[PDB]
Each structure stands twice: as C-alpha cells, then as structure tokens.
C-alpha cells in the first residue's frame, strides 16, 4: 500500500489505467496507444462521443 | 575442490559429486552441460571460467 | 526527410528453397555426442522462402531492383542475407509503422548499432545511403531516411563505435548473415550466424547452427517488418535525390517459422552439425 505517497487531498489523477481495449493483452505486453475506442457500430473520427 | 567427492553449489545449482578438469569447450552463452539423461555433468566455474 | 524512390523496374516476386538453414540452439545448455529432440519455432526443411534482390544493371531496359517491402511477422522470421558491400542496414518491426503504435528499429548507422523501441513515424520508403567521392575515392555515409519523428518510448541502446567500411566491392557475394527473430512473452529473441561462402545468385546449401545473439526486453506487438537497405550515390547516376541513386548488389531471403519438432545432433565438440525435421 502506498496511500501515504500516491494519494492527494484533492485527488491524485497522475495514475491511469487502460479501459475499453479491443482484445486482451498478451503476456508481458505493453499498450500505450491513446486511440479512441469504438464501442458501438458508429465509427469514430478521433473524437469522443 | 577438485578430484574429491564434495557437495557443490554452482550458481544456485546444488549437487554432490567429484569435480575434474574438463576438455569440453563451452560456448560463451552456455553455463551448464547435461548428458542424455538430462543430468548436469559439466559446469563452468563462475569465477575461474 | 521522407523521400520515395523512383525509376524502379517491376518484376514478379522470386521464391527459392531453404534446404536445412534456420536451425538455432534451443537453449544455453552444452550437449556433446548426443541426439536431442526439441519442439520449438523452427524454419521447416526445404521451405518456400521469398527472395528479394538489390541490383542496378544498366542498359536500354536493364533492371533496377531495390526491394524493401513490408512483410508479415506471423510467428518468427528467418532472414538470410548474401552480400559483399554491407547493403542491408537493418530492420523495423511493428504493427502499424507510424506514430500510433510503438515500433522496434534495429539499424547500423555505419558507426554504431542502434536498437530503439520508440514511437516512430516511419517513411513510406525508408533507407540509408553512402556517397562516393571521385577526389577521395572513398565512400562516406550521408543519408538516413528511416523515420520522420521519434516519440513516446522506453528502449534505447547504442553500440560501441566502429568503422564498417562502405566500399562498393565487386564480384561474388563474400558474406552470408543469418538471423532468427522471435517475439515471445514480450521478448525479442535474436539468433545470429555468419558464414564466408562464395557463390553468385542463390542461397548456399548447407548446415550452420545459429547461436543466440540478444534477448531484448521489448514488450510490443509485432505483426509486420520492413528491411532497411543502403543505396549508393556518386558523380554518376545523376538525379534529384529520388532517382539519382544506384543499388549495390545484394540479396536477402525471408522465411517463416512454425512450431516443429527437430532432432539435432551434437558432436563431440558441442556443435549442432545436423538436424532432422520430424
Ligand atoms: C505520449 O505522447 C504524448 C504527446 O507528446 C507530445 O506530442 C509528441 C508528438 C511530441 O511532440 C512530444 O514531445 C510532446 O510532448 C505525451 O503528452 C501528453 O499527450 C496528451 C495527449 O494524448 C496530453 O493530453 C497531455 O497533456 C500530454 N502531456 C504532456 C506532459 O505532454 C504523453 O505523455 C504522458 O501521457 C499523458 C496522458 C500525461 O499523463 C503526461 O503527463 C504523460 O507524461 C505520452 N505518453 C507516454 C510517454 O506514456
Ligand atoms: C497486434 O496487432 C495486430 C494488427 O495490428 C492485431 O490484429 C488486429 O486485430 C483487430 C481486432 O483486435 C482486427 O480488427 C484486425 O483485423 C487485426 N489485424 C491483423 C493484421 O491481424 C492484434 O489484435 C494485436 N494484438 C494485440 C494483443 O493487441
Ligand atoms: C573474479 O571473477 C573474474 C571472472 O570474471 C575472474 O577473472 C577473477 O579472477 C575473479 N577474482 C577473484 C579474486 O577471484
Ligand atoms: C511517398 O508515398 C506516400 C504514398 O502513400 C505519400 O503519402 C508520401 O508523402 C510520399 N513521400 C514523399 C512524397 O516524400
Ligand atoms: C512458392 O510460393 C509461390 C507462391 O506463393 C509459388 O508460385 C511457388 O511455386 C512456390 N515454390 C515452390 C517451390 O513450389
Ligand atoms: C547513428 O546514430 C548514433 C546515435 O544514434 C550516432 O552517434 C551516429 O553518429 C549516427 N551515425 C551517423 C549519423 O552516420
Ligand atoms: C574527403 O574526405 C574528407 C575527410 O575524410 C572530407 O572532409 C571531404 O569532404 C571529403 N571529400 C568530399 C568531396 O566530400
Ligand atoms: C573437434 O575439435 C577438435 C579439436 O579442436 C578437432 O580436432 C576436431 O576436428 C573437431 N571435430 C569436428 C567434427 O569438427
């Protein structure tokens, strides 16, 4: 636990996690892309909505 | 200790036996040698090489 | 920076037979006078291997082949190279060769060896280039057109400086370099071997076990790769940096590894001298 280091009174937002990936990651694989995820059938064009 | 029956711990690999000078020429990336029974029968000394 | 080459003659792809090449040491365990059976990603014996040329033969039509296409990286790549003037400069591996995804660059800058996992905006026609000076009668490296921008990365490695003479030797191929590239569990496995050899056109027939070269902790998704070559410029073949170039004679062969069981023979000296594809 690192609550005394990685927590801020107003909220520490410097740590991020990847959500909405097309497929599961392979072992020891890193994905740092920031492309907009397409959950529905409507294509995205680099914008969120 | 050579030419004597001793317990040996070579780079974490433990065993018992007699160590003698070997004519085998290990490749630079190789550390252990095994026979047809998969037993460690040759070893490179980590210090004297 | 980004420059696309022109005046390239269109020719059908070439295919050759890999007889027994592509065998590498499965592990780092010494074995002597044994027959060892192991299941691993191997190049099948007598496999259909793609062949790419780099050659400029003059004439009314001639042939100007400078082959650096983007080839698939399915499960592992056997890359053989027959050359005499060090034409092959390196490779780039990735999924989308642009800034969207991270890519691995293994290049020879004619002074150091650069291995970089970085977000590269690769050119459509990436290459390297040396220049021949009539007064000096020497070849110097002058062009590096692999990528446009590099950003958002982790992996950097620069080798010790060397000379790596760039003279345009003429005659027969005097170097055969074999590489095995694998991408397993976030690790880029590179096995390498070098052979003198002496022949004209095709891949030499024989056996040569590839020894482990490097274990890069890469950790990226790889499905495609492109070979970065070196072109020649001099007082001849004039142009505007897009058509004023000549390609030194070289060939490189690409094959794909599959999960196979191989029976290798370790001689009394611990060298793999023969193999059987079960
Ligand atoms: C991934 O790249 C982002 C863009 O880098 C900028 O653009 C490049 C083309 C190049 O010119 C480079 O020099 C620039 O700095 C990094 O910056 C973040 O980009 C996001 C847009 O997706 C933006 O919202 C952030 O403000 C910006 N931050 C900074 C400090 O520039 C990324 O940096 C990291 O990711 C961010 C989400 C943020 O957490 C930032 O603090 C991080 O350092 C790069 N990501 C990496 C390196 O993981
Ligand atoms: C590694 O990259 C390949 C290609 O970029 C990914 O395969 C693609 O997967 C998407 C869906 O996930 C498909 O729509 C594409 O058609 C696929 N392309 C190819 C060439 O196969 C693969 O999913 C990636 N692997 C990981 C673990 O992210
Ligand atoms: C330390 O190990 C090296 C092997 O790299 C060896 O050459 C050297 O003799 C060793 N020194 C001592 C004091 O044992
Ligand atoms: C090379 O061709 C591609 C075609 O996809 C083009 O996008 C790129 O701009 C060209 N490079 C140049 C003109 O330098
Ligand atoms: C190799 O494959 C190509 C097409 O992929 C085919 O034309 C050629 O005949 C094959 N080689 C052999 C020896 O069958
Ligand atoms: C190749 O790159 C290395 C470091 O990236 C650099 O030191 C070297 O000078 C380069 N070689 C050239 C530009 O010919
Ligand atoms: C010849 O070599 C010298 C140093 O090696 C270099 O400064 C000079 O530019 C070269 N000649 C030409 C025409 O580039
Ligand atoms: C094994 O090594 C010895 C000594 O170096 C040599 O005489 C012998 O020819 C080698 N065996 C083979 C098959 O090369």
Swiss-Prot record, chain B:
Changing residue 37 to D: In strain: Alpha/B.1.1.7. Binds to host ACE2. RBD also interacts with the N-linked glycan on 'Asn-90' of ACE2. Cleavage of S generates a polybasic C-terminal sequence on S1 that binds to host Neuropilin-1 (NRP1) and Neuropilin-2 (NRP2) receptors. Interacts with host integrin alpha-5/beta-1 (ITGA5:ITGB1) and with ACE2 in complex with integrin alpha-5/beta-1 (ITGA5:ITGB1). May interact via cytoplasmic c-terminus with M protein. May interact (via N-terminus) with host bilirubin and biliverdin, thereby preventing antibody binding to the SARS-CoV-2 spike NTD via an allosteric mechanism. Attaches the virion to the cell membrane by interacting with host receptor, initiating the infection. The major receptor is host ACE2. When S2/S2' has been cleaved, binding to the receptor triggers direct fusion at the cell membrane. When S2/S2' has not been cleaved, binding to the receptor results in internalization of the virus by endocytosis using host TFRC and GRM2 and leading to fusion of the virion membrane with the host endosomal membrane. Alternatively, may use NRP1/NRP2 and integrin as entry receptors. This is Spike protein S1. The gene is S. The chain holds residues 534 to 582 of 1273 of the full protein.
